[PDB]
Amino acid sequence: FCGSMMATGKLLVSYAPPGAEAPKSRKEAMLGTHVIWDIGLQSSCTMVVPWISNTTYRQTINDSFTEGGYISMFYQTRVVVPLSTPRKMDILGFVSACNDFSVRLLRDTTHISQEA
Amino acid sequence: ANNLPDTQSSGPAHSKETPALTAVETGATNPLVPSDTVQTRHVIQKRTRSESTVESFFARGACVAIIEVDNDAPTKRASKLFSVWKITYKDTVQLRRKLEFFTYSRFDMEFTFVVTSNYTDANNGHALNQVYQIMYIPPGAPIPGKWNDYTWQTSSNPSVFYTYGAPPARISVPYVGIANAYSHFYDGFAKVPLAGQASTEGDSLYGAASLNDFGSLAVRVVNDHNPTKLTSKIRVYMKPKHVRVWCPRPPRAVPYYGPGVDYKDGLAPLPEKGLTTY
Amino acid sequence: GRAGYTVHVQCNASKFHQGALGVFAVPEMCLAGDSTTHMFTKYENANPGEKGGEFKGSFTLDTNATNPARNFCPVDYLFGSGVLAGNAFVYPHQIINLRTNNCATLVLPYVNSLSIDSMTKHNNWGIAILPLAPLDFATESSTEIPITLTIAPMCCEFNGLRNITVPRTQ
Ligand SMILES: O=C(O)c1ccc(NS(=O)(=O)c2ccc(N3C(=O)c4ccccc4C3=O)cc2)cc1
Numbered sequence: 001f002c003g004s005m006m007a008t009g010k011l012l013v014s015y016a017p018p019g020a021e022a023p024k025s026r027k028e029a030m031l032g033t034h035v036i037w038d039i040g041l042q043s044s045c046t047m048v049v050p051w052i053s054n055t056t057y058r059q060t061i062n063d064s065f066t067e068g069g070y071i072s073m074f075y076q077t078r079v080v081v082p083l084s085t086p087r088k089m090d091i092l093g094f095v096s097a098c099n100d101f102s103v104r105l106l107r108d109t110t111h112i113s114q115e116a
Numbered sequence: 117a118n119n120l121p122d123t124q125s126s127g128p129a130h131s132k133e134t135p136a137l138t139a140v141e142t143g144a145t146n147p148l149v150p151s152d153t154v155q156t157r158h159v160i161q162k163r164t165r166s167e168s169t170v171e172s173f174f175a176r177g178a179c180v181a182i183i184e185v186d187n188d189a190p191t192k193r194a195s196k197l198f199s200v201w202k203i204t205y206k207d208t209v210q211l212r213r214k215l216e217f218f219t220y221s222r223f224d225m226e227f228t229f230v231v232t233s234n235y236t237d238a239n240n241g242h243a244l245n246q247v248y249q250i251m252y253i254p255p256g257a258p259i260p261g262k263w264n265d266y267t268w269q270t271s272s273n274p275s276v277f278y279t280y281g282a283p284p285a286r287i288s289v290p291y292v293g294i295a296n297a298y299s300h301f302y303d304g305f306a307k308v309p310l311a312g313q314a315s316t317e318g319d320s321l322y323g324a325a326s327l328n329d330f331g332s333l334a335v336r337v338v339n340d341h342n343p344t345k346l347t348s349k350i351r352v353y354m355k356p357k358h359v360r361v362w363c364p365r366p367p368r369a370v371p372y373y374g375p376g377v378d379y380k381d382g383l384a385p386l387p388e389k390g391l392t393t394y
Numbered sequence: 395g396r397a398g399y400t401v402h403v404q405c406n407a408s409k410f411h412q413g414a415l416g417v418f419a420v421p422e423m424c425l426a427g428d429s430t431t432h433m434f435t436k437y438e439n440a441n442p443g444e445k446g447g448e449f450k451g452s453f454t455l456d457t458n459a460t461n462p463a464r465n466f467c468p469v470d471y472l473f474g475s476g477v478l479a480g481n482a483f484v485y486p487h488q489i490i491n492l493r494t495n496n497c498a499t500l501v502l503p504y505v506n507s508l509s510i511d512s513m514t515k516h517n518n519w520g521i522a523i524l525p526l527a528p529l530d531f532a533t534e535s536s537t538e539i540p541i542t543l544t545i546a547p548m549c550c551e552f553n554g555l556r557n558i559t560v561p562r563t564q
């Protein structure tokens with residue numbers, strides 16, 4: 001959370017394992033895995049997306065058989081600021097792998113290409 | 117009924133411990149003693165809380181009902197030769213309020229019956245000493261329909277025959293609840309209405325559990341009628357015994373209105389008093 | 395059905411706001427009705443669901459005899475049951491004082507006169523939230539802040555399986 005120190009709020013960060021309609025409101029999202037983040041002195045919050053999969057591995061392509069689920073963020077209460085404070089702020093997102101993470105079947109990427 | 121802690125001598129304080137300051141937001145009460153904020157002497161405390169135990173608080177017979185019966189010719193349709201009183205502590209207020217300091221309770225109950233009688237007129241002779249029958253009718257037992265029908269045989273119901281002029285009758289019952297405690301408050305219904313049921317089905321009074329939870333007392337004058345009409349009142353006094361209570365509640369502040377928590381009148385209990393007036 | 399609860403009331407504001415909420419967990423929280431008929435609140439209104447209900451500032455008697463509302467009329471200073479609200483602190487409670495905290499957490503055991511009871515017929519607990527000190531903020535426009543309840547059943551235990559109960563609504 002990169003707002004002012006005088007800004008307060010509670011957010012909800014949710015992970016819904018796949019197979020149902022994607023959460024489009026907090027009511028559905030709070031039924032899945034979720035963390036309620038209180039914006040305070042500690043300005044960062046981490047939600048672990050646990051490994052929940054039918055297959056022992058997922059493919060690194062878009063494929064419904066090994067789909068991973070849905071990640072969403074909602075306002076739990078709301079952002080509240082006093083006067084003389086910016087009413088719009090930014091949050092930044094980061095992602096990393098946990099210590100249980102692994103990959104296999106080396107392959108060439110689609111992220112780099114060359115032309116004659 | 118335990119004794120109270122002695123007050124310990126406490127001298128001047130100059131330190132970073134601040135018992136005076138607290139945070140009621142936590143929901144806890146600051147357990148301060150006088151020595152925390154003023155200098156105190158040593159006092160050997162001799163006062164005790166023997167009379168504020170729940171047992172001592174309820175160890176009193178309270179009048180819960182006044183059952184009026186008559187001894188008169190059965191042809192006199194105005195006279196009432198027997199009376200049925202459904203058992204409850206909610207016909208009066210005092211014992212009710214004391215009990216409703218708490219949400220749940222277990223207790224044995226002592227019933228004491230004080231019977232008084234009088235002539236109604238003076239031009240029809242006199243009367244011989246009356247005997248009164250007080251029959252407990254547990255829920256489901258047949259309720260008397262007449263002062264002299266078969267039900268008064270009381271083969272299985274407990275009955276007390278009280279002779280007028282004798283000391284008030286008295287009996288005891290154990291804790292008879294079908295639950296593990298009496299519920300002074302029930303936030304629910306006897307029925308859950310079901311979708312599709314007509315509006316006349318599944319409807320029950322809010323907060324009532326059973327239509328007849330503890331049965332009734334049926335009271336009559338056993339004697340055949342004298343030529344003159346006699347009126348009697350049986351005052352019922354309840355005393356809880358071996359009381360246990362759970363989940364204290366704020367006491368009733370406005371007049372009771374029915375057997376529920378409803379209120380209609382007297383909604384302005386507090387009087388007027390200046391903020392800066394001692 | 396049987397369950398305890400973890401109730402978490404969430405209400406954040408700024409250091410320039412002020413106000414206090416009393417959050418009370420009331421066993422057997424019976425509320426007063428709105429009519430001359432005793433104990434007349436209907437099941438549908440007594441069980442509003444997640445939306446809950448609101449305390450009122452004064453008692454209004456429902457005089458519509460043809461189509462009675464049969465609803466609660468819980469007055470705030472009577473704590474909705476004819477007892478002074480100031481004494482509601484005898485109940486398990488916390489205070490959200492906006493200058494101090496922005497949340498309250500009440501852990502409620504199963505409280506009842508029975509080991510287990512019918513959850514559809516009987517509400518074991520009530521949650522009451524009363525503004526002990528009014529919300530205020532240095533602006534002419536009326537400020538508003540949200541309160542969010544997050545409740546977790548705990549040690550849920552169910553008995554007597556059969557076809558599903560479908561309570562009447564509306
Ligand atoms: O003299 C006193 O001790 C006595 C005198 C007054 C009193 N309070 S009262 O408000 O006047 C009152 C007066 C009568 C009844 N009452 C009835 O009228 C009745 C009829 C049938 C069964 C039970 C009852 C019963 O409680 C209840 C309360 C209680 C007891």
Ligand SMILES: CCCCCCCCCCCCC/C=C/[C@H](O)[C@H](N)CO
Pocket residue numbers: 203204205225227250251252274276287289292293297298299300325329330
């Ligand atoms: C002459 C013998 C008569 C014996 C009568 C035995 C009945 C005992 C009744 C005790 C009264 C308990 C108080 C009431 C408890 C709560 O109100 C109920 N749980 C809810 O209605």
